[PDB]
Amino acid sequence: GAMGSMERASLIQKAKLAEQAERYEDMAAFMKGAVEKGEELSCEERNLLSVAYKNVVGGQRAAWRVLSSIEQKSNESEEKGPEVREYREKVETELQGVCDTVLGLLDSHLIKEAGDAESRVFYLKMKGDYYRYLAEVATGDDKKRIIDSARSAYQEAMDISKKEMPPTNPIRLGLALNFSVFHYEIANSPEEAISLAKTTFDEAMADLHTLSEDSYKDSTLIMQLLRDNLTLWT
Amino acid sequence: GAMGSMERASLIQKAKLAEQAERYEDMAAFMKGAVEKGEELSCEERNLLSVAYKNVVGGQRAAWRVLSSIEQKSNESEEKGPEVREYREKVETELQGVCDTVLGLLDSHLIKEAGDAESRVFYLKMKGDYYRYLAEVATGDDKKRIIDSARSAYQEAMDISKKEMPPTNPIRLGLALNFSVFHYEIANSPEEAISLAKTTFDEAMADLHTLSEDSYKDSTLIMQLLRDNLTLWT
Amino acid sequence: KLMFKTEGPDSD
Amino acid sequence: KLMFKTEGPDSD
Numbered sequence: 504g505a506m507g508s509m510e511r512a513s514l515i516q517k518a519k520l521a522e523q524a525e526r527y528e529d530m531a532a533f534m535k536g537a538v539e540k541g542e543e544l545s546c547e548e549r550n551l552l553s554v555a556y557k558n559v560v561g562g563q564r565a566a567w568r569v570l571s572s573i574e575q576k577s578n579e580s581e582e583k584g585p586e587v588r589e590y591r592e593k594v595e596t597e598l599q600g601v602c603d604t605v606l607g608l609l610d611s612h613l614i615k616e617a618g619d620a621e622s623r624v625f626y627l628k629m630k631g632d633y634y635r636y637l638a639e640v641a642t643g644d645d646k647k648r649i650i651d652s653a654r655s656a657y658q659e660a661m662d663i664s665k666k667e668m669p670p671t672n673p674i675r676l677g678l679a680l681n682f683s684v685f686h687y688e689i690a691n692s693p694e695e696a697i698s699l700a701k702t703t704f705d706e707a708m709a710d711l712h713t714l715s716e717d718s719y720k721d722s723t724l725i726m727q728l729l730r731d732n733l734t735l736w737t
Numbered sequence: 738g739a740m741g742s743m744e745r746a747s748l749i750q751k752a753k754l755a756e757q758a759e760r761y762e763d764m765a766a767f768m769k770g771a772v773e774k775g776e777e778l779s780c781e782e783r784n785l786l787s788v789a790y791k792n793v794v795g796g797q798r799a800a801w802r803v804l805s806s807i808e809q810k811s812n813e814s815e816e817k818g819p820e821v822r823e824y825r826e827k828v829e830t831e832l833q834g835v836c837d838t839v840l841g842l843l844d845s846h847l848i849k850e851a852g853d854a855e856s857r858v859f860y861l862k863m864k865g866d867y868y869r870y871l872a873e874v875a876t877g878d879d880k881k882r883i884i885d886s887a888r889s890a891y892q893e894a895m896d897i898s899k900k901e902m903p904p905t906n907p908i909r910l911g912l913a914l915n916f917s918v919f920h921y922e923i924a925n926s927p928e929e930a931i932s933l934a935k936t937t938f939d940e941a942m943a944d945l946h947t948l949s950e951d952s953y954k955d956s957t958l959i960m961q962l963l964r965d966n967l968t969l970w971t
Numbered sequence: 972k973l974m975f976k977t978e979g980p981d982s983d
Numbered sequence: 984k985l986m987f988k989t990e991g992p993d994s995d
């Protein structure tokens with residue numbers, strides 16, 4: 504909408520400037536505008552899109568958790584009125600709106616035009632991630648369907664990644680990391696989470712010998728996140 | 738405007754929640770709504786107002802400085818088009834808008850109803866501060882008038898504080914700190930800045946003996962900021 | 972809440 | 984830019 508009059512290249516340039524300035528709401532708006540130009544995104548551009556919205560939704564998630572914790576303590580004492588619930592609901596609605604925006608970009612029309620594994624897996628992982636963030640705050644009759652939407656997106660991404668990417672591929676590794684966290688604390692499947700993280704780590708370890716020094720650093724960074732979680736889980 | 742239907746007490750409560758959640762834009766909007774109820778603010782409420790807008794404008798100032806530095810380097814190479822200037826201008830305009838909002842609250846009608854030294858000095862200091870933030874980005878035919886507006890507000894606050902507050906009073910100390918920075922880098926009066934910081938520090942030191950343990954901690958915290966600056970300046 | 976590691980900026 | 988100490992949250 505509001506970025507319709509700005510050149511695609513100018514939007515990308517300004518997204519990079521916004522990142523440097525830690526202006527992530529601006530960065531996300533610029534990248535939404537770039538997506539809405541209708542052209543596919545390059546690897547760099549996909550990462551600008553993801554970094555922008557991850558920073559925006561991350562602030563909302565952290566705020567939601569603070570408010571939810573206060574709300575639970577208040578229930579559970581002394582009654583303080585409706586304000587804690589109201590304000591948690593306000594932040595929650597804003598968070599859901601950001602997730603809906605990202606999911607809308609993926610559905611119109613990033614995923615359907617993504618044919619290469621590195622783009623298609625990236626976007627399907629994002630779809631799983633933003634349904635997962637919706638699941639984190641879901642409590643009603645749609646929670647099961649939200650969880651299954653996350654699961655379905657992650658599973659399609661996993662199936663493609665295992666067929667089309669080596670086990671050290673950083674996109675594949677980050678997908679497996681996030682799907683394992685989905686299992687652990689959204690699907691209440693901690694054993695599946697542990698199995699996935701262990702198998703992913705071990706198969707990546709065995710493929711490191713094929714990599715350059717730089718690719719080795721990329722892959723081992725994400726492998727360490729799998730290990731971090733396994734240490735907390737076992 | 739948009740907070741007109743919410744109770745004053747609910748706005749204050751939600752400002753405190755927003756602070757805990759690090760949602761400073763929300764915190765500022767809640768406190769603007771509370772100010773617009775027309776009643777005077779308590780000490781706690783004044784501090785909620787100031788903390789909220791200080792956090793908002795602080796993010797804008799930091800972003801503006803990043804973009805201004807990139808812009809200067811670009812002038813100063815290879816010509817990159819209008820985008821750096823445009824985006825710096827965007828952030829600058831947003832920053833000026835926040836400053837204008839705060840100044841508008843002070844002028845309608847916080848300052849004119851503030852009769853006690855602790856409220857009047859607090860608000861006049863804020864007026865100096867937000868004209869100072871406008872001065873940081875000012876380049877045109879109004880820069881001198883913006884600087885003089887900051888100076889005038891700080892000077893009225895100083896005159897009241899010296900007559901009505903002890904030299905260790907934390908409001909008085911923070912005013913002197915900020916006015917000294919105004920002198921150093923807005924008014925290009927480094928010697929005035931150094932003199933003010935030194936005199937303020939020394940007169941506070943000589944009054945510490947009158948204070949409780951808790952007031953001593955409050956005052957020495959700000960005294961250390963004066964010392965920090967003097968160490969960089971001398 | 973204890974948050975586990977996920978991909979990308981740890982922005983929450 | 985080198986920023987000097989001013990009162991309150993160091994939010995920039």
Ligand SMILES: N=C(N)c1cc(-c2ccccc2)c(-c2cncn2CCN)s1
Nearest residue numbers: 519522545546547548550551554673721
């Ligand atoms: N602006 C950002 N945050 C990013 C930009 C890029 C990127 C991607 C391709 C080409 C040029 C830059 C990122 C990236 C994602 N996978 C690897 N890379 C490179 C660095 N490791 S991340």
Ligand SMILES: N=C(N)c1cc(-c2ccccc2)c(-c2cncn2CCN)s1
Nearest residue numbers: 753756779780781782784785788907955
């Ligand atoms: N919510 C915040 N950030 C603040 C609240 C208060 C405050 C002020 C008066 C009464 C109760 C709380 C602040 C304050 C400012 N001068 C001293 N104080 C107290 C703590 N030192 S600051």
Ligand SMILES: [Cl-]
Nearest residue numbers: 589590593751
């Ligand atoms: Cl609310």
Ligand SMILES: [Cl-]
Nearest residue numbers: 517823824827
């Ligand atoms: Cl712009």
Ligand SMILES: [Mg+2]
Nearest residue numbers: 591592595596
């Ligand atoms: Mg809700």
Ligand SMILES: [Mg+2]
Nearest residue numbers: 693694697737
């Ligand atoms: Mg067992």
Ligand SMILES: [Mg+2]
Nearest residue numbers: 825826829830
């Ligand atoms: Mg301008």
Ligand SMILES: [Mg+2]
Nearest residue numbers: 927928931971
């Ligand atoms: Mg000399």
